[PDB]
Amino acid sequence: EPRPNEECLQILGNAEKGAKFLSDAEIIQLVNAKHIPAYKLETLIETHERGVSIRRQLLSKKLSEPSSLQYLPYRDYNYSLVMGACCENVIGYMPIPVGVAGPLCLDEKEFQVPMATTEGCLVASTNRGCRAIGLGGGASSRVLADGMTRGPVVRLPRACDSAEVKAWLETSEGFAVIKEAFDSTSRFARLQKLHTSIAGRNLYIRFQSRSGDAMGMNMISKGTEKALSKLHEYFPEMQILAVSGNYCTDKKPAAINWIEGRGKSVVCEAVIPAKVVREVLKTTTEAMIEVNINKNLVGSAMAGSIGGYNAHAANIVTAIYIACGQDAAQNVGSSNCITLMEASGPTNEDLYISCTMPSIEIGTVGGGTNLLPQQACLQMLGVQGACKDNPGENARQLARIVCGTVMAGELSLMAALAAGHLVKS
Amino acid sequence: EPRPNEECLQILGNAEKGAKFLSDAEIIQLVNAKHIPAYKLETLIETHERGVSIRRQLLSKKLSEPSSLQYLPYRDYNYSLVMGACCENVIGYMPIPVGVAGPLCLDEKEFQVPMATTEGCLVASTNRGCRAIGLGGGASSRVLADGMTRGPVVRLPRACDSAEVKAWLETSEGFAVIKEAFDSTSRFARLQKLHTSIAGRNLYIRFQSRSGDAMGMNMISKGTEKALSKLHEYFPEMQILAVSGNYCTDKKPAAINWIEGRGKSVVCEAVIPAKVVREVLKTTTEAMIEVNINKNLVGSAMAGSIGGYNAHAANIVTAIYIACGQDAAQNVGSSNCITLMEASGPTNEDLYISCTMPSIEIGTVGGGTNLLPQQACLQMLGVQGACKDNPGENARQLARIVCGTVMAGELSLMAALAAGHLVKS
């Protein structure tokens, strides 16, 4: 039934037939022995699933084991929201187990926190830390700052010239002009204080702005493009080298994120009664403080850590992020956390605990949050999509939930380490 | 039909009946009137899918939106390998779109590389970087080191005693004693030179060893347990404060991983002819090196980066990790990368590129790699499971692939920044 190549190509270019009529082996035969290239399988074929299936068959014959894809599932998944948006050369999907850790008592509310992980004991441990938090009157958090950044590098012909652009940007008149250009690109675009830094005839300019409920990379980058266009009108010798000169900084470790913040800067806290630490966490307060100082402060310091003065906030950040359609690679900066434990109340037997996380890069609109399964997890928290009355509130709430769930996860791993657990039981 | 609470209880305490003979609403009426806790749902119910179903039903009526879970899938998924191994309190699974970039021409072989992401353009950009490497003759990698670590903190009564223990561990006979205890806990356990650091009466002890094709955390922790128990026979006043004093360092940014290594230290390289840089990357070598020097080195320096001297290593690392059953939270350390670009060839128009990644924390057995869909992705690369013939070969191969694919994504992203793109197109 697989027709000759010259004939199949005619039915393809037929506007009232298309690949809908061609068989699987015929679409394959045209990719092989080049005619339809390979990447162009996306736009031609009838349904999205049949494109995934064809691409899987092509892929199977190139592999050293033909049936590698047998347990990689692809059927019945909604690919309409994925193609052209979230992923390319799609051959299926990867199911990541999702557990629940809660209720999380935070700001006089309750939250059932979804967490997608394959590390056993992670969700149970976090769930225990939530119960301890809940039995001690609950947690409270504050968003200290909010604004996604982009950190382009431009080049003037000399360091003195880039010193002049730095001085001009620092004047209130220069900032008003660059803020007009930036703010015109979108209704959420509101440029805050510019931070600049020189390295010879390079000039790194840190544009920061809130992005409503989106994480905001696409919004700040568009705002930055036009802003540097307006700056170029005043300084035509300027050469834009890159929209990112790693000064944002995005998806790399960097002290500037730790010190200036990026996206949402958050602080959570709680006071656990001496009873709850004993019963739920199987330790004392004196022991928790001892482990936290010498592990999370002194230990991190001996390791040469910048922004890693914590136990495992990266476990909780990553688990929520995958569950809620966040950019999981932004875990690199979003895990930044200092966990602090001290005595509280009369005997100095109650455990004070606070996690401060300067650079939670998060958003409840765009990216993976347009997909329905990760919209479901966002809906658990009540933060799905945009907030009309109070733009930004949903992404800020989710940032607060991340910091609170980190603190829950911190209480439980630190408690296990304090009561002598060396291995995953 | 829904029977009273006491009738349902004695059916649940019956052996040749049990939970199979109750309806969902009856089990839920038992949980509401506090006869069965939430965590007891795992061991009472017959099937795992029915346990996930009933946990979802309770969860839904605690939420502000009772239909929020509608689009979080849960059915027809193999929870036999998840319950009590990878996740707890399971309410479903989050599907991450999976894409393929390849062939990745690495060490005279070809790799179809799975990439689970929700960020648009990442799989297509990475795939273009692969094309540039393929038409450039290919890439070559070496594994420079190998050994997962654990960095426990112990406490001596005084600093003079911690110094005594440090000197003892540095003697070849004291080290032999501890290497015997450590190696006895597993067939892969081979303890390497002990790196130690004192902070007052604290002593941080960095145990390092290979772990076959396992990532190594369970195996190193077990070897660390017995090793410290032997050290205590020689120094009984020693206090084992925590199995991790953040010296390892695991899932936090730390300079020690950058300088000493953790897991696999790997380097990848390639020469991209000027012709390939022109037709695939749409830019010149000269423009590309200018961006790399001033973004990936200088820019990263101004930012105060330790080990983040790259464009988006974290994008590629994270995507391969989710797809292949790795711990995504370990992208914090595993993303460590310095990207170098120089001029090669006749008139300095070719592009020598290399990515050095000293701390890739990876494996092909254990964790999420026991799950069949994550195994499907590992089979794409011919690195699933353990190697009987040559232990470590699979995990070393996946680490070489993570490095070469990072370099593919570096080429492509850096080309796009060089060519004047400031926004995703």
Next chain:
Amino acid sequence: PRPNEECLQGAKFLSDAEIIQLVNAKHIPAYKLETLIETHERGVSIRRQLLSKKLSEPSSLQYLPYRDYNYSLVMGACCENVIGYMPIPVGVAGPLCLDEKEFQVPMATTEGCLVASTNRGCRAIGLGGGASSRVLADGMTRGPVVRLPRACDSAEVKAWLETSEGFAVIKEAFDSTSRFARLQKLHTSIAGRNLYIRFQSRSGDAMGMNMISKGTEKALSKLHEYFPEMQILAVSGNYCTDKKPAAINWIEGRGKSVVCEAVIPAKVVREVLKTTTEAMIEVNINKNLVGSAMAGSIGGYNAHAANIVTAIYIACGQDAAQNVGSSNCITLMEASGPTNEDLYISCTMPSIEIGTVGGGTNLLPQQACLQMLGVQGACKDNPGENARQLARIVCGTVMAGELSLMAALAAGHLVK
């Protein structure tokens, strides 16, 4: 010698053995003698002789000099328990062509080749038409740590400081304590119920440490009136950061942030520096950026800025302990000119902590070195321009030092 009863009854009429024997049988306490003796130089001699009696080598103080020094400006100012002085050889590297001027730079060092090397660096810069420089920013900082009952309370204080009216009353309290106290933008960080506050201000030509400490004093007291439950834990919570390696000094700057640059003709790199522009760029990329990167350095992207900074600081009465942060520097080298064969060099030092008044700039030997550079004392027609000028000179002299050593390294020097 006379007995010990005739001496208690002034101090000028007694001998050195007499006052010593009063403390050696416990007649008089030792914290009395500071004021008792008339001449300052005999206070030093006695303190030495008392100290000789405790050392296993009595005569080890023999070649530690002490005579013919002006101790009047030091005592109750720069040093205590003074037993003499330490001579540090001063050399001169110049002339240095910087912003249409020439500078003979004094360098107090005991390291061989350092002054000759820096001096060759100046020769290369001179023959390439000199160096240019700009002060990018200027503000000494101080970073107290305060605590409030909860993290929610300290968040409230942070928000309060970020409004214009909160910053206005804090600026009112800060500016009141001194002439030069003009408070710039505040920077804050929270860690739980901790709150770190970075007060930045110019301070005339002084380095400013004590001035900002006074400004921070009244400013925290004002914040205490707004927030009565605020414990003031310390005036320095290491957030300044003063005399320790910190990323915040590198990123925000501290004291003077300065940039400096030069082009060295291809001919000059060949004949004076004995290398090639290409090779210089190769060593700079791979040593000062890639190498420092591998070593895990924050702000140490240079060859030996600290050699030059420390030498000038000791000679010019600066606080040499501040070389920790002042040495922060990134040396960049690029190709330049029509044939791409000329060597563009630039050093960027974001945190040079410096001044030309107060501290050890009060001493006459140190003021001699400051006068060489034409920057001594307070600039009367532009308060703070002498301190700016010395910072600029440090950056240009640091760049000269980089040129020479990197040229040496590139020509295969494993010496000295």
Next chain:
Amino acid sequence: PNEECLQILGNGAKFLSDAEIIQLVNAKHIPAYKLETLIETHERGVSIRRQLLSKKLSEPSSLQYLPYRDYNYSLVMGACCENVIGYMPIPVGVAGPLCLDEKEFQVPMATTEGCLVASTNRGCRAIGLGGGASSRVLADGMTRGPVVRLPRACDSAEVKAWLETSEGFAVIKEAFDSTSRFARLQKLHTSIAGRNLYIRFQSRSGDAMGMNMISKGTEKALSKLHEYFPEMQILAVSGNYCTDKKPAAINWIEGRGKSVVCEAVIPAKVVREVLKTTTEAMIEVNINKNLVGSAMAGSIGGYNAHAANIVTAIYIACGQDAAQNVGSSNCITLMEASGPTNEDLYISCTMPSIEIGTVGGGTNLLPQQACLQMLGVQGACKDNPGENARQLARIVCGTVMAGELSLMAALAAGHLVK
């Protein structure tokens, strides 16, 4: 007369006055660089240089108060300094006794910062009344960290693996060790960054700081490496991997020079009467300043109050390289409760990269030697090579801790200005 004075230059220089030599330079019969030799004495060669310099300054009376007479320039010329125009007096104060390891020390400190010696001295008083401090040198080994390039990263991987084999390190150790009597190479640490290779040589240097000695050994060791790997370019003797006089985490973790630890318990009475505070307030300030504060500031290795003050003061006093306080001041200061009722103050400073020596450099000069002799660590130690330098490093750590106790007590007592 111009032409008359040239004829006398051959017979000498001492039969020409200062004004006659200077006229010979200003109308160029002789260049500027011919003063090191022709002028017969060191003090008078400095004098003519100052006169030549004085005319080029906008204020020609600039150098009147820079001293130069009656100083030993012979140990300075061609070893410690060049283009010498005088010396710079730094006041030396004294802080002691410092009770360290069953001994007493009077510690010299060259500083122009008010209250530093007086405060360092109060910290000694608290330590003395607490029953003395203790200390241990945990490591010793100056490093050099050169950079080399091979054609490929694969080739540099081949060299790293070779340098890790028992036999590769044996051939290298032997070449390094032959150049000096103290040259004894410990295990190598290598990091690759592409086709670059950063090799960290480490060896003790007797009582010398070791920069010259390990440079010699590194040079020789790389020439043996070049014989096994001819395509290897030697880029630079330092690829900043040592790392010398720059902030770098490799010194914090691996150490460089003397890694040292120090400790002491300070009784409750002593904290209240000498230091005017409590153990509980000191602990609170130390946690939140030296740990949390430094963490918030992005500190690598600077977990202390003012270690750099003490290190700089002693270094300049004792003829050390004061530039090297960049890394030698790396310190973590820890305070916790101690004793039966948690009222005594355990304190410890750990300083992993103290770069120190008692022979060579500024320790060849006599005033600097006087300060070393006070401590009893001057010059080489014939019986136990290295022991004078280890003792000075222990003194630096103990004195720093005295300095931490004092300043931290002042901050805890509520003093905001000095």
